[PDB]
Design a protein around this motif. Structure first.
Motif, PDB file in Angstrom:
ATOM      1  N   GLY A 151       0.817  -1.247   0.000  1.00 62.34           N
ATOM      2  CA  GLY A 151       0.000   0.000   0.000  1.00 62.34           C
ATOM      3  C   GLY A 151       0.833   1.272   0.000  1.00 62.34           C
ATOM      4  N   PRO A 152       0.180   2.426  -0.223  1.00 62.05           N
ATOM      5  CA  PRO A 152       0.900   3.695  -0.321  1.00 62.05           C
ATOM      6  C   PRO A 152       1.532   4.164   0.996  1.00 62.05           C
ATOM      7  N   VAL A 153       2.691   4.810   0.884  1.00 63.01           N
ATOM      8  CA  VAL A 153       3.374   5.436   2.015  1.00 63.01           C
ATOM      9  C   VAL A 153       3.868   6.811   1.591  1.00 63.01           C
ATOM     10  N   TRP A 154       4.074   7.687   2.568  1.00 61.52           N
ATOM     11  CA  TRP A 154       4.736   8.958   2.305  1.00 61.52           C
ATOM     12  C   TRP A 154       6.194   8.683   1.959  1.00 61.52           C
ATOM     13  N   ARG A 155       6.701   9.407   0.963  1.00 65.34           N
ATOM     14  CA  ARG A 155       8.072   9.228   0.459  1.00 65.34           C
ATOM     15  C   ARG A 155       8.980  10.398   0.817  1.00 65.34           C
ATOM     16  N   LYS A 156       8.611  11.105   1.873  1.00 67.16           N
ATOM     17  CA  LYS A 156       9.378  12.213   2.400  1.00 67.16           C
ATOM     18  C   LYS A 156       9.260  12.163   3.942  1.00 67.16           C
ATOM     19  N   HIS A 157      10.180  12.809   4.656  1.00 68.15           N
ATOM     20  CA  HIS A 157      10.195  12.712   6.121  1.00 68.15           C
ATOM     21  C   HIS A 157       9.489  13.877   6.825  1.00 68.15           C
ATOM     22  N   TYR A 158       9.431  15.054   6.193  1.00 64.92           N
ATOM     23  CA  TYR A 158       8.738  16.202   6.790  1.00 64.92           C
ATOM     24  C   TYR A 158       7.297  16.240   6.287  1.00 64.92           C
ATOM     25  N   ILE A 159       6.347  16.052   7.198  1.00 60.60           N
ATOM     26  CA  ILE A 159       4.922  15.963   6.880  1.00 60.60           C
ATOM     27  C   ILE A 159       4.219  17.116   7.583  1.00 60.60           C
ATOM     28  N   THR A 160       3.300  17.775   6.884  1.00 56.77           N
ATOM     29  CA  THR A 160       2.542  18.858   7.488  1.00 56.77           C
ATOM     30  C   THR A 160       1.095  18.437   7.731  1.00 56.77           C
ATOM     31  N   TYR A 161       0.499  19.033   8.760  1.00 58.21           N
ATOM     32  CA  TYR A 161      -0.929  18.903   8.997  1.00 58.21           C
ATOM     33  C   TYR A 161      -1.535  20.262   9.270  1.00 58.21           C
ATOM     34  N   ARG A 162      -2.839  20.350   9.049  1.00 63.24           N
ATOM     35  CA  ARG A 162      -3.597  21.568   9.281  1.00 63.24           C
ATOM     36  C   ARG A 162      -4.948  21.186   9.858  1.00 63.24           C
ATOM     37  N   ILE A 163      -5.375  21.903  10.891  1.00 66.53           N
ATOM     38  CA  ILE A 163      -6.696  21.710  11.479  1.00 66.53           C
ATOM     39  C   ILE A 163      -7.648  22.674  10.776  1.00 66.53           C
ATOM     40  N   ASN A 164      -8.488  22.108   9.917  1.00 66.52           N
ATOM     41  CA  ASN A 164      -9.388  22.865   9.046  1.00 66.52           C
ATOM     42  C   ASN A 164     -10.403  23.687   9.825  1.00 66.52           C
ATOM     43  N   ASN A 165     -10.916  23.067  10.877  1.00 69.02           N
ATOM     44  CA  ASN A 165     -11.965  23.645  11.705  1.00 69.02           C
ATOM     45  C   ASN A 165     -11.959  22.910  13.035  1.00 69.02           C
ATOM     46  N   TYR A 166     -12.610  23.499  14.027  1.00 68.11           N
ATOM     47  CA  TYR A 166     -12.573  22.990  15.388  1.00 68.11           C
ATOM     48  C   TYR A 166     -13.931  22.553  15.880  1.00 68.11           C
ATOM     49  N   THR A 167     -13.975  21.384  16.511  1.00 70.28           N
ATOM     50  CA  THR A 167     -15.198  20.941  17.148  1.00 70.28           C
ATOM     51  C   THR A 167     -15.570  21.878  18.305  1.00 70.28           C
ATOM     52  N   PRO A 168     -16.855  22.237  18.416  1.00 70.13           N
ATOM     53  CA  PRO A 168     -17.299  23.032  19.572  1.00 70.13           C
ATOM     54  C   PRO A 168     -17.401  22.210  20.860  1.00 70.13           C
ATOM     55  N   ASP A 169     -17.139  20.909  20.782  1.00 68.17           N
ATOM     56  CA  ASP A 169     -17.207  20.035  21.940  1.00 68.17           C
ATOM     57  C   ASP A 169     -16.082  20.280  22.942  1.00 68.17           C
ATOM     58  N   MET A 170     -14.987  20.897  22.491  1.00 70.53           N
ATOM     59  CA  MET A 170     -13.761  20.992  23.277  1.00 70.53           C
ATOM     60  C   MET A 170     -13.214  22.402  23.242  1.00 70.53           C
ATOM     61  N   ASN A 171     -12.364  22.719  24.214  1.00 75.36           N
ATOM     62  CA  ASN A 171     -11.565  23.937  24.142  1.00 75.36           C
ATOM     63  C   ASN A 171     -10.606  23.859  22.954  1.00 75.36           C
ATOM     64  N   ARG A 172     -10.418  24.978  22.272  1.00 70.99           N
ATOM     65  CA  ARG A 172      -9.539  25.007  21.099  1.00 70.99           C
ATOM     66  C   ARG A 172      -8.137  24.457  21.406  1.00 70.99           C
ATOM     67  N   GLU A 173      -7.558  24.892  22.520  1.00 77.30           N
ATOM     68  CA  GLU A 173      -6.200  24.479  22.848  1.00 77.30           C
ATOM     69  C   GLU A 173      -6.125  22.978  23.090  1.00 77.30           C
ATOM     70  N   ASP A 174      -7.215  22.394  23.584  1.00 79.00           N
ATOM     71  CA  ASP A 174      -7.268  20.956  23.832  1.00 79.00           C
ATOM     72  C   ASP A 174      -7.353  20.159  22.536  1.00 79.00           C
ATOM     73  N   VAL A 175      -8.033  20.700  21.529  1.00 73.82           N
ATOM     74  CA  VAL A 175      -8.029  20.069  20.210  1.00 73.82           C
ATOM     75  C   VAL A 175      -6.611  20.073  19.649  1.00 73.82           C
ATOM     76  N   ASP A 176      -5.973  21.239  19.685  1.00 72.04           N
ATOM     77  CA  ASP A 176      -4.602  21.352  19.193  1.00 72.04           C
ATOM     78  C   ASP A 176      -3.690  20.337  19.881  1.00 72.04           C
ATOM     79  N   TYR A 177      -3.782  20.258  21.206  1.00 68.17           N
ATOM     80  CA  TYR A 177      -2.878  19.395  21.966  1.00 68.17           C
ATOM     81  C   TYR A 177      -3.149  17.913  21.694  1.00 68.17           C
ATOM     82  N   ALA A 178      -4.418  17.517  21.668  1.00 67.21           N
ATOM     83  CA  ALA A 178      -4.764  16.123  21.382  1.00 67.21           C
ATOM     84  C   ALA A 178      -4.208  15.679  20.025  1.00 67.21           C
ATOM     85  N   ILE A 179      -4.359  16.532  19.013  1.00 67.75           N
ATOM     86  CA  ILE A 179      -3.885  16.199  17.672  1.00 67.75           C
ATOM     87  C   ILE A 179      -2.350  16.163  17.645  1.00 67.75           C
ATOM     88  N   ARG A 180      -1.710  17.146  18.271  1.00 70.08           N
ATOM     89  CA  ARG A 180      -0.255  17.167  18.337  1.00 70.08           C
ATOM     90  C   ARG A 180       0.279  15.911  19.009  1.00 70.08           C
TER      91      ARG A 180
END
Ligand SMILES: [Ca+2]
Ligand SMILES: [Ca+2]
Ligand SMILES: [Ca+2]
Ligand SMILES: [Zn+2]
Ligand SMILES: [Zn+2]
Length: 158
Positions: free
Chosen positions: A1-30
């Motif tokens: 199956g497919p794999v990333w062929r580079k070592h530096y990968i970026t992510y972006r949080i498109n939008n935030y669930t209203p269920d949680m504090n913003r900083e907690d979403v950031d931290y959980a994903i990080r």
């Protein structure tokens, strides 16, 4: 199956669930990305504009792909394997109630599983593996990948 062929990968949080504090979403994903960078050569960085490799989205019902969500329960989230465009992206069902703890559905634990898919892992038949296809809360502060998960990811990277 497919794999990333580079070592530096970026992510972006498109939008935030209203269920949680913003900083907690950031931290959980990080923290979820760190689980996988711990056991591979991959490095993950959060970006706030432009095209990331892995776009993180909270959405409900039909939301522009072939994996329509289904209300509270059932499918909690889904993710695309490595590739361009929607490849890598991880979508979380907003009809769940996301949390930092054992109540609702724990975002960190679910994100660990989905990011596994974003990196090219499939499911495990081992109930102790994070890549097992049913959610179960385990203490997030002492979380450790199973031997099965480590073998799975190290078959793809490092
Ligand atoms: Ca992508
Ligand atoms: Ca659902
Ligand atoms: Ca919600
Ligand atoms: Zn989706
Ligand atoms: Zn899965």
């Amino acid at each position: 199956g497919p794999v990333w062929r580079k070592h530096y990968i970026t992510y972006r949080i498109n939008n935030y669930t209203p269920d949680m504090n913003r900083e907690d979403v950031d931290y959980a994903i990080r923290k979820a990305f760190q689980v996988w960078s711990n056991v591979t050569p991959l490095k993950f960085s959060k970006i706030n504009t432009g095209m990331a490799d892995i776009l993180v989205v909270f959405a409900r019902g039909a939301h522009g792909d072939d994996h329509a969500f289904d209300g509270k329960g059932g499918i909690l989230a889904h993710a695309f394997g490595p590739g361009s465009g929607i490849g890598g992206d991880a979508h979380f069902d907003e009809d769940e109630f996301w949390t930092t703890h054992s109540g609702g559905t724990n975002l960190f634990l679910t994100a660990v599983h989905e990011i596994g898919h974003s990196l090219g892992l499939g499911h495990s038949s081992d109930p102790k593996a994070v890549m097992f296809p049913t959610y179960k809360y385990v203490d997030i502060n002492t979380f450790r990948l199973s031997a099965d998960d480590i073998r799975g990811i190290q078959s793809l990277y490092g």
